[PDB]
Amino acid sequence: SPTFKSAVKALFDYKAQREDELTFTKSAIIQNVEKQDGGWWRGDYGGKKQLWFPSNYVEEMI
Predict the structure, then answer these.
(1) Conformation bin of residue 46: beta by default, left when phi > 0, alpha when psi is -120 to 50
(2) According to its UniProt record, where is this protein located?
């Protein structure tokens, strides 16, 4: 129930390649991001919850 401020901004468009991936447009704010060190993060955007996307496509809003 504590909620983390963990947002990133998409620097490029990304189209989901698998059902568990997020699709987003450049400049999107992706929210509730969990950061992992294998090149894939997960977050919320566009009505999708906790789907995966490549970390190199975004800017961390720290």
Answers:
(1) left
(2) Cell projection, Lamellipodium; Cell projection, Ruffle
Q: Residue 61 and residue 7: Cα distance in Å, rounded?
A: 6
What is the distance, to the nearest Å, from the Cα of residue 11 to the centroid of all Cα atoms in its chain? 11
Dist. CA 17–CA 6, nearest whole Å:
24
Q: What residues contact residue 21 under an 8 Å CB cut-off, 6+ apart?
A: 14, 51, 52, 53
Overall domain count for the chain: 1
Between CA 57 and CA 41 the distance in angstroms is 10
Concatenate the DSSP letters of all residues of 14-28 into one string: B--SSTTB--B-TT-
Domain of residue 20: give its range.
Answer: 1-62
Q: What CATH number should be reported for the domain holding residue 5?
A: 2.30.30.40
